[PDB]
């Protein structure tokens, strides 16, 4: 088991209903990959520094899981399958390298 951080950027549109459907496939998929969600941060939709998928915004979802290394990649795959999923960046956790303080 190792600790990561799953980043996901979704279609900045979609009704309150669909948005929850993706989060349904996420959770579902997550578990299926030994995903122990130790945290989350649904930062919401934000204006991107550049258009991603033709749109000038995206809906950001941040987590913090612990799971079997041998599957991180697989999980990552499964996630990207959905269309409303435009970005998936899983970064191995790390202690904050404080600076200027």
């Amino acid at each position: 088991m190792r600790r990561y951080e799953v980043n996901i950027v979704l279609n900045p549109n979609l009704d309150q209903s669909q948005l929850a459907l993706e989060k349904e496939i996420i959770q579902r998929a997550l578990e299926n990959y030994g995903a122990r969600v130790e945290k989350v941060e649904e930062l919401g939709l934000r204006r991107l520094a550049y258009p991603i998928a033709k749109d000038p915004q995206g809906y950001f979802l941040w987590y913090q899981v612990e799971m079997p290394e041998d599957r991180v990649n697989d999980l990552a795959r499964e996630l990207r399958i959905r269309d409303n999923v435009r970005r998936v960046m899983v970064v191995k956790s790390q202690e904050p390298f404080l600076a200027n303080a």
């Binding site: 941040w62 904050p96 390298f97 600076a99 200027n100």
Partner: peptide
């Protein structure tokens, strides 16, 4: 760096 306070250089967000 001067004109700024503490910050986690490893925070990509």
């Amino acid at each position: 760096k001067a004109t700024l306070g503490e910050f986690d250089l490893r925070d990509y967000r």
